[PDB]
Amino acid sequence: AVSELEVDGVVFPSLARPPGSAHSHFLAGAGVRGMEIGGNFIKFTAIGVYLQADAAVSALAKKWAGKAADELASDAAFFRDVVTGEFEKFTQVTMILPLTGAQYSEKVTENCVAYWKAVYTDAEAAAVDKFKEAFKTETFPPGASILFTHSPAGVLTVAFSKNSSVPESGGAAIENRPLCEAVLESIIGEHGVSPAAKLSLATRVAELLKEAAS
Amino acid sequence: AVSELEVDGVVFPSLARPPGSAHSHFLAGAGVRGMEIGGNFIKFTAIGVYLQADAAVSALAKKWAGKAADELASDAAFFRDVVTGEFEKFTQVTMILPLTGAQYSEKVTENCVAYWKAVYTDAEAAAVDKFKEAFKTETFPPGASILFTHSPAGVLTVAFSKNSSVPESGGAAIENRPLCEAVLESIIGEHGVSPAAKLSLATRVAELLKEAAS
C-alpha cells in the first residue's frame, strides 16, 4: 500500500529505488529534524526512512505484529530492531537550512566516536576517516539531499543529490557495520535526532503489519 | 578521471551511483535528442550515458585500446560493444520539453519490435508490456528524469526522478536481454536517437583507455 509524505517542502516518494541497492524500498517514515535554540524549534533538515520492500515487515512481524502505533513508539527494542534488521535500509536527508559537509560529518561522527570511546577499533577510525573525507569538499543548499544506503552487511553507500539527475557518488562504499548502523541510529535511536521520524515510522509500520492479516 | 557535463541546463555528474547498482558509474558521454522543425532545431531530451567504473574500461580496452577517438566514432562495432559489454551500464533521460509515460514507452517499443518483427520470442512481448505498464501512469514535465539501469546479463531497472529526493521506483526489474540492450542502443546504436551522445562517448572513452593503458 503505502503513501508518499511531505515534510516542510520536501516530497518523499512512496516506493523508491535507492542508489547502491538492488531492491525497491517503501517509505517507512518521515519527519523534521531540528534544534532547540533560545526556546525555539528551528527546523534544519527533513529526514525520510525507507525499508526493503518485502524483507522488512516479514522480518519485523515476528516480534511486532499486532502491536499498535503507541505501543511500537514506546518501545526502544522496536527501533533497535529496525536499525539492526537483517534487511536493507535507506535514509534521505534533505536540507531546509544550509549545512556544510564538514560540520555534518563533524557531529554525526563525534558522537559515534564518543560512545565507542566509552566502551572503538582501528576499523572504526578508518571508516570515520573515509566518511568525513567523503564529506568535506561538499556543500548543501536548501533542497540538496544526502542519500544513505544501509545494506544488510554493514556497507554504507553515500550519494549526494542536488537537482534531479542521478545521485552523485560520495566516494567508495564504506564497509563498517558499526558506522553504517550508527548513522541511522543517530536518527532513530534512543536519543534519536528526529523524534518526528520515529513517530511517523512506528505508526505506518503498525498499519502495514496489521494489513498483512488477510 | 572524468568531467561534469552540462547539456542545455541539465547537469550530469562525472561519477554516479545509479539505483539497482552496487557500483559507481562514470559519465561516459552526454548530448541532446534533437529534431528539425520548421524554422529551428528543437531540443527534446538531454541524455547521459554512464558505464561501470572499474569494469567498462577493462572490457573495452583490448579490442579498442590504442585506437583513436576518430576510429571509435566512425565504427558502429564499438557502440555495439558498449551496448553489449559484460559490465553494467546506466542511462539518464531528462526532459526539458514535456512528455508522457505512454508517449515515451511507445517511443521505444515499436522500433525494437520492428527489428524483432523481421529478424520475436514471447519473453520480448511480455517484457514489452511490463515496460509499457511500468510507464503508463507517469508524466514527465521539464526537468524530470528517467533512470535506466542495465545489468550485464540484461536485467533492466527503471526509476523516475522529478526532484532531489531518492528516485521513485518504476516497478519490478525487467529481465530480458533484447529489451535491456535495445533501450540503450536506441540512444547510441546505428540509428541512435542522440548522435551527440555517441560523439561525446567516443571522445571520453578513448582518452580513458589511453589513460588506463599503461
Author numbering:
A (entry chain B), B (entry chain A): 1 to 119, 122 to 216
Give verbatim lines from the article.
In plants, flavonoid biosynthesis begins with phenylpropanoid metabolism in which phenylalanine is transformed into p-coumaroyl-coenzyme (Co)A. Chalcone synthase (EC 2.3.1.74), the first enzyme responsible for generating the basic flavonoid skeleton, then catalyzes the condensation of three molecules of malonyl-CoA with one molecule of p-coumaroyl-CoA to form chalcone. This is followed by the intramolecular and stereospecific cyclization of chalcone into (2S)-flavanone—a precursor of many downstream flavonoids—by chalcone-flavanone isomerase (CHI; EC 5.5.1.6). Type I CHIs—which are found in most plants including barley, rape, petunia, Arabidopsis, and rice—isomerize naringenin chalcone (2',4',6',4-tetrahydroxychalcone) into 5-hydroxy-flavonoid; whereas type II CHIs, common in leguminous plants, utilize both naringenin chalcone and isoliquiritigenin (2',4',4-trihydroxychalcone) to synthesize 5-deoxy-flavonoid. The family of genes encoding CHI in Deschampsia antartica—one of the only two vascular plant to naturally colonize the Maritime Antarctic—was recently characterized at the molecular level. The crystal structures of the unliganded and isoliquiritigenin-bound forms of DaCHI1 revealed that DaCHI1 can bind to type II substrates suggesting that DaCHI1 can produce antioxidant flavonoids from various substrates for protection against abiotic oxidative stresses.
Unliganded DaCHI1 was crystallized in the C2221 space group with two molecules in the asymmetric unit. Our analytical ultracentrifugation results showed that DaCHI1 is a monomer in solution with a standardized sedimentation coefficient of 2.14. The final model of the unliganded DaCHI1 structure contained 218 amino acid residues in a β-sandwich fold with seven α-helices (α1–α7) and seven β-strands (β1–β7). The β1 and β2 strands formed a short β-hairpin structure and β3–β7 strands formed an antiparallel β sheet. The seven α-helices were located at the concave surface of β-sheets and the active site was formed between the antiparallel β-sheet and α-helices. The substrate-binding cleft of DaCHI1 was conserved, with hydrophobic residues from β3 (Met36 and Ile38), β4 (Ile43, Phe45, and Ile48), β5 (Val94 and Met96), Leu100 of loop 97–101, α4 (Tyr105 and Val109), α6 (Ile190), and Val196 of loop 192–197. Several important catalytic residues including Arg34 (Arg36), Thr46 (Thr48), Tyr105 (Tyr106), Lys108 (Lys109), Asn112 (Asn113), and Ser189 (Thr190) were also preserved (residues in parentheses refer to those in MsCHI). The final model showed Rcryst and Rfree values of 0.222 and 0.278, respectively.
